[PDB]
């Protein structure tokens, strides 16, 4: 299921400012290469962030309201195996590798479920 | 981005040639065992743009910034069988096999322009090395979530 | 006419609910007939009994434009005075003309006189006409004479000063000729034993109001069909905003190359953008379209998918109605 | 004077269709085919000024991608049974000093007048479809 | 817009015979000999649009190997007793974004119009037989 | 003066990219941690002038000496993600985002002309480095307190 | 296609005399002076094909050594009382794939048409006598 990353902005992310803003640009491979979809999230008091996140390739940026530009928190690849209740600093550590091509081979499971659907569709005719 | 890797793909399965024996370019990679005929897709040539398209889609509403361009990517064949892997490439480039395998590689493929057997000074010895030239033309793209205009309210005035 | 009507013999509170359904006893015709429940089909269930709608008002003209999109309206009867401001406001809001006649009784500058009320109110779309006989037919030949214009030819913007009409003129003396000229009415009278229709300028000129109205409606429609039927939806790209500016600029071209607007100096003081470009374009091109920048539009209305408010400024072409000339004799 | 443009190239649109695949490297160009006024000049400080009827007649050379929506539009225009009139505008946005002005140039009834010289190479890539729409009135205003 | 071609050069075939020995380096080229519409332009915003009868008349310059099956076909065409009409097509395959489209250009009744300038050198190799088949209708569609 | 810093601003918030990761040019600045993809606005290209305007103002009476000019400023992207930050820039340069964010930067922005993946000899190793070219055109100005002429007395003579 | 020539240059012989002192660097060149067929083209898909009477008329520019047996022959031809007709052939040998073919081009009644521009230098050696024999029929066959 879709994940929900939350925590308190601490450490290298900066001081827990009660107005800090984050921005995720998702690279959803749309038709030919991909489409980038932006979304900006803000934080409650005490520097607290709490927000759900879809699966796929997300680039996270951080900046403070009234600042001059963002800061590159970095890339990440949320997959169907990352923990759901996780902090952002922790997730930033699980950046996207180039295993994606091996990941593409998870289509074997899809092939199998298609095979089982074909079987349990065909058999009932009797 | 992906263009050089794509032409590497095309040369990978036009010559029916190995993964580990095609290295890219002026990266860091050791050429051990000179006779192991390598192929490298030298992309050092300047890629120059040609046009900057901009298309827009209506229903699944996003738009599409494109940039057609071309680069004189050269191919350097190494190894004792450099000459053959030069010629046999320099000649199959415009066959069925090539023109049929470069299906989805979003990358045109022009004719081989010229060749050269410029070897490399391997330290008091000469290792076989051949360059073949051919302009390659492709077009990277990106998609952006803009949004359309559904109407336009406005007012006029007159003397 | 391609429609299949099915009506029960009984009238009143009898329902043909079914959309032809399906019988298990044969091969259906319902689906191919196009009157299935899923298929779009109008099914006006039988009313209970005879119904007696109360008498509406002439204001009920709201319904007519609700269904036909006419632009020039009439009424067989004379419009009673108390309804005059209401129908005038309706004309101003629903973007059409309404021609009406009055007898000589309404020849005054008095507020109690409804037509002068229209003039002072600026209800310029409510055109007022004069007939001593009260010849309501005079409206017809009037409506039938103004609207003959194509808005695509070279020069077609016509006034109505002295245009042939299809109703007998009447007899007036001078004083009410002048009064009608200065209170907005129009006169169909005799000049050199001929039909002579004279317009007025107290209320806005017939040519001017009709031209402006067709212009605004045409701008609206060209902008609309640029935007939802062109099948390539135009973005908020600055190129796209320029496209939407060019659409109205092209229509303004169509109108200056039509006879409605001509280049000239700008008399008014109010303007937009900046004086220099404004007056320069009007004196040269006869129109000026300046579209608000995407910058000046907040995100709140951007997500509303509405462009900035375009501002177009036009100048009418002068129509000769009077000529005054003086001739001396050097002997 | 001080001047800076938005809108890299003059954004252009004919028949309510905007050109968005412009060959990079000076695609659009407007050329005045004729003068603005011919004169006959007689003796002793006398001339006659007459603005020709070919005043604004401007040819617009467009360079577009070899097979693009823009070239599709121009081509479908070229191959119509009845040659399609072209009306529209070439314009740029630009801020004079701080004030934002718009420099527009209308383009009245125009048409194809030189087809692209369709060239296809192998040595070198060439996607260069150059149309020439030559109008009659091209009035710049600003 | 985004675009990529299969088929390096526009694959070409006249009279059901396909050209396969094309001199590398921009062999084919299509040139429009004339306009698409001439106009007469009168006063005060008035023009007249007339598509000429020479609309599609396009010259196709072909460069082929000095003595090749393609040059053999073209030469036998050139030396016929009765000049041989040429009908056929120039076309390319190309994938727009993901969709595969084909851009075709018919070539109606045409004929030789400039023989190759037969040049033979010793300094430098030269196998450059350039024919020019100029048709009357060359309609590109896509 | 301000032009290079302005184009740095434009590239700062077209790529939504960091302050500290855009350094200017052939200044002194250490490129530590090669993978940290930097961007530098190389201004070493000769800027050539085009015109020297001179305007004059009447009421708040001063005048205005302007000088339009242009420079082939190149952009060098570094870091493991050099290629992307090249292409993704080389293609967003002519979008809404760019053409909408360069509002007050008194600086036109032309199309990206050409690209190159010329790397840098980092001492027995190759670090990713890509140049993209685009002419930039701007116009510095200065204002001077001169003063107008309200009248002109004078005398004539004749034979 | 695969092709290789014997006979470096097209061995040439006029009036049973063979040219053997050919200025190195593209001595021979055959130029078609005219078209092969002119056409008139009328409305709605109609053309008329007519092969001209000047079909094969080809000029052959020959470059020979300043004072050579070949230039002696050409000169004695040039200075004859009655201009001497030239008949002969230009041809090459060439092996297509393995098969040996011969590509021949006849040259019918022809004559001098441009004398060499006799230039003598001191800076630099120049032995470049360029004659132009322009025939009427030049049919290549192969």
Q: Output the six-digit token pair for C202.
A: 């107290």
Q: How far is F101 from chain D (nearest CA, A)?
A: 10
Q: Which helix (H) or strand (E) element contains residue G3? A: none
Identify the CA nearest to D65 among candidates E56, E60, B70: B70
Q: Output the six-digit token pair for D131.
A: 């149309």
Query: How many residue pairs from chains D and F have C-beta atoms closer than 8 A?
Result: 38
- Look at G41 and E54 and tell me if their CB atoms are within 8 Å: yes
* Chain F partners within 8 Å of A57 (Cβ): none
How many CB atoms neighbour CB C158 within 10 A? Answer: 18
For residues E69 and E87, the answer to whether their CB atoms sit within 8 Å is: no
CA angle A105, A111, A113 (to 5 degrees): 125
Distance of CA C119 to the CA centre of its chain: 18
Identify the CA nearest to D16 among candidates G53, C110, C156, C233: C233
For residues C79 and C54, the answer to whether their CB atoms sit within 8 Å is: no
Phi, psi of F150 (to 5 degrees): -90, -25
Distance of CA F77 to the CA centre of its chain: 16
> Given CB atoms, is D55 within the 8 Å cutoff of chain B?
no
> Given CB atoms, is C240 within the 8 Å cutoff of chain D?
yes
Identify the CA nearest to G73 among candidates G88, G57, G58, G56: G88
Q: What is the DSSP string of D72-138?
A: HHHHHHHT-SSPPPEEEEEEEEEESSSSEEEEEEEEEEEEEEE----B--SSS----EEEEEE-S--
How many C-alpha atoms does B109 have within 13 Å on its Cβ side? 28
* Non-local CB neighbours of E60 within 8 Å, separated by 6+ positions: E28, E29, E30, E31, E90, E107, E110, E132, E133, E134, E135, E138
> Given CB atoms, is E98 within the 8 Å cutoff of chain A?
yes
For residues C244 and C297, the answer to whether their CB atoms sit within 8 Å is: no
- CA torsion, points B83, B89, B90, B94, in degrees to nearest 10? 170
Q: Output the six-digit token pair for C305.
A: 């998918």
What is the distance between the alpha carbons of residues E135 and G47, in angstroms, rounded to a whole number? 9
DSSP 3-state assignment of C284?
Answer: helix
The neighbouring-strand residues paired with F73 are F134
How many CB atoms neighbour CB F19 within 10 A? Answer: 13
* Non-local CB neighbours of B125 within 8 Å, separated by 6+ positions: none
Q: How far is C230 from chain D (nearest CA, A)?
A: 9
For residues C151 and C71, the answer to whether their CB atoms sit within 8 Å is: no
DSSP 3-state assignment of G19?
Answer: coil
What is the distance between the alpha carbons of residues D24 and B66, in angstroms, rounded to a whole number? 12
Q: How far is E42 from chain G (nearest CA, A)?
A: 27
Touching status, chains B and D (3+ beta-carbon pairs under 8 Å) = yes
Task: Note the resolution in Å, 1 decimal.
Answer: 3.6
Method: cryo-EM
Burial C104-114 (b: 16+ CB within 10 A, else e): bebbeeeeebb
What is the distance between the alpha carbons of residues A6 and C195, in angstroms, rounded to a whole number? 86
* Chain A partners within 8 Å of E2 (Cβ): 32
For residues G11 and G91, the answer to whether their CB atoms sit within 8 Å is: yes
Give a three-class secondary structure readout of chain B: CCHHHHHHHHHHCCCCCCCCCEECCCCCCCCCCCCCCCEEEECCCCEEEEECCEEECCCCCCEEEECEEEEEEEEEEECCCHHHHHHHHHHHCCCHHHHHHCCCCCECCCCCCEEECCCEECCCCEECEEEEEEEEEECCEEEECCCECCECCEEEEEC
Q: What is the DSSP string of C132-165?
A: TT--THHHHHHHHHHS---SSSSS-----TT---
* Chain F partners within 8 Å of D95 (Cβ): 106
Identify the CA nearest to G86 among candidates G67, G105, G112, G58: G112
DSSP state of C61: H
> Given CB atoms, is E40 within the 8 Å cutoff of chain D?
no
Q: Which partners does chain F have (≥3 C-beta pairs < 8 Å)?
A: A, B, C, D
- CA torsion, points C98, C99, C104, C107, in degrees to nearest 10? 50
How many CB atoms neighbour CB E129 within 10 A? Answer: 24
For residues D132 and D99, the answer to whether their CB atoms sit within 8 Å is: no
Identify the CA nearest to C288 among candidates D55, D137, B159, D97: B159
* Chain E partners within 8 Å of C257 (Cβ): 45
* Non-local CB neighbours of E83 within 8 Å, separated by 6+ positions: E77, E111, E112, G36, G37, G49, G50, G51
Phi, psi of F103 (to 5 degrees): -70, -70
Q: How far is D121 from chain E (nearest CA, A)?
A: 4
Phi, psi of B47 (to 5 degrees): -90, 125
Q: Output the six-digit token pair for D128.
A: 């260069």
DSSP state of G45: T
- Look at F114 and B44 and tell me if their CB atoms are within 8 Å: no
**E36 → closest Cβ in D53, D115, D118:** D115
What is the distance between the alpha carbons of residues E11 and E20, in angstroms, rounded to a whole number? 8
* Chain E partners within 8 Å of A31 (Cβ): 97-98
> Given CB atoms, is D123 within the 8 Å cutoff of chain B?
yes
For residues B116 and B131, the answer to whether their CB atoms sit within 8 Å is: yes
What is the distance between the alpha carbons of residues B64 and F91, in angstroms, rounded to a whole number? 10
Indicate the angle between helix axes C84-94 and C114-121, nearest 10 degrees. 30
What is the distance between the alpha carbons of residues A89 and A10, in angstroms, rounded to a whole number? 8
């Amino acid at each position: 299921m879709s994940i929900q990353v939350t925590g308190i902005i601490e450490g290298p992310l900066g001081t827990p400012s009660p107005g800090i803003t984050i921005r995720v640009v998702s690279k959803i491979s749309y038709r030919n290469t991909y489409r980038l979809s932006t979304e900006d999230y803000v934080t409650t008091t005490g520097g607290a962030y709490d927000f759900q996140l879809n699966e796929g390739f997300h680039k996270i940026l951080i900046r403070y309201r009234g600042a001059s530009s963002f800061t590159k928190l970095g890339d990440v690849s949320v997959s169907d195996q990352t923990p759901s209740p996780i902090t952002l600093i922790n997730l930033l550590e699980s950046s996207s590798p180039k295993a994606l091509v091996v990941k593409l081979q998870e289509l074997a499971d899809e092939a199998s479920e298609s095979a089982q659907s074909a079987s349990d569709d065909a058999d009932q005719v009797t | 981005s992906q263009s050089i890797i794509n032409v590497a793909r095309y040369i990978r399965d036009l010559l029916d040639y190995d993964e580990n024996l095609i290295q890219f370019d002026r990266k860091n990679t050791q050429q051990s065992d000179t006779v192991t005929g390598y192929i490298v897709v030298n992309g050092s040539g300047v890629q120059n743009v040609l046009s900057h398209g901009s298309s827009y889609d209506g229903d699944a509403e996003i738009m599409e910034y494109s940039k057609s361009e071309s680069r004189l990517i050269t191919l350097e064949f190494y190894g004792s069988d450099a000459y053959e892997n030069a010629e046999l490439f320099s000649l199959l480039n415009q066959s069925q096999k090539a023109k049929e395998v470069s299906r989805g590689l979003g990358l045109t493929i022009y004719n081989v322009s010229q060749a050269t057997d410029v070897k490399q000074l391997l330290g008091y010895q000469y290792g076989n090395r051949v360059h073949v030239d051919f302009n390659i033309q492709y077009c990277p793209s990106v998609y952006v979530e803009t949004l359309r205009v559904d109407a336009s309210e406005f007012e006029i005035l007159v003397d | 006419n391609g429609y299949f009507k099915v009506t029960s013999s009984t009238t009143g509170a009898t329902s043909l609910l079914s959309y032809l359904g399906v019988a298990t006893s044969g091969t259906d015709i319902s689906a191919v007939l196009g009157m299935n429940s899923e298929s779009g089909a109008v099914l006006t269930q039988g009313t209970d009994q005879v119904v007696l709608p109360a008498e509406t008002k002439l204001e009920g003209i709201t319904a007519i434009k609700s269904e036909v999109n006419i632009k020039g309206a009439m009424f067989i009867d004379q419009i009673l005075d108390a309804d005059i401001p209401g129908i005038a406001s309706f004309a101003g809001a629903n973007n059409m003309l309404v021609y009406e006649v009055f007898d000589t009784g309404y020849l005054s500058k008095n507020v109690s006189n409804p037509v002068w009320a229209v003039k002072l109110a600026g209800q310029s779309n409510f055109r007022c006409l004069l007939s001593k006989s009260g010849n309501r037919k005079f409206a017809a030949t009037y409506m039938a004479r103004m609207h003959t214009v194509l808005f695509s030819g070279q020069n077609t913007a016509i006034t109505m000063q002295l245009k042939e009409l299809s109703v007998t003129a009447e007899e007036y003396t001078d004083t009410e000729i002048a009064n009608a000229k200065t209170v907005g009415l129009d006169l169909l009278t005799t000049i050199k034993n001929e039909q002579a229709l004279l317009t007025s300028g107290a209320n806005d000129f017939c040519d001017n109001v009709y031209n402006l109205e067709a212009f605004r409606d045409e701008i609206q429609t060209n902008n609309y069909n640029l935007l939802k039927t062109t099948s390539t939806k135009i973005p908020q790209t600055d190129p796209g905003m320029d496209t939407i500016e060019d659409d109205t600029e092209k229509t303004c071209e169509k109108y200056v190359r039509n006879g409605v607007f001509a280049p000239g100096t700008w008399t008014r003081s109010d303007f937009f953008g900046d004086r220099q470009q404004f007056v320069d374009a009007i004196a040269q091109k006869g129109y000026y379209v300046l579209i608000g920048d995407l910058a000046d539009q907040t995100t709140a209305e951007r997500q509303s998918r509405v462009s900035p408010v375009i501002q177009i400024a036009v100048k009418n072409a002068g129509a000769v109605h009077e000529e005054d000339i003086i001739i001396s004799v050097n002997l | 004077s001080v001047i800076v443009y938005r809108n890299n190239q003059s954004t252009l649109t004919l028949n309510g269709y905007t050109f968005q695949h412009l060959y990079q490297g000076a695609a659009l160009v407007l050329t005045p085919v004729n003068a603005k006024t011919a004169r006959t000049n007689s003796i002793n400080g006398g001339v006659s000024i007459s603005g020709r009827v070919d005043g604004g007649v401007h040819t617009l050379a467009i360079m577009v991608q070899k097979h693009s929506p823009d070239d599709k539009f121009l081509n479908d225009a070229k191959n119509s049974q009845e040659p399609v009139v072209f009306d529209g505008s070439m314009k740029r946005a630009y801020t004079e000093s701080g004030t934002l002005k718009k420099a527009t140039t209308t383009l009245e009834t125009g048409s194809i007048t030189t087809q692209p010289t369709k060239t296809d190479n192998n040595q070198d890539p060439d996607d260069s479809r150059t149309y020439v729409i030559e109008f009659r009135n091209s009035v710049e205003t600003f």
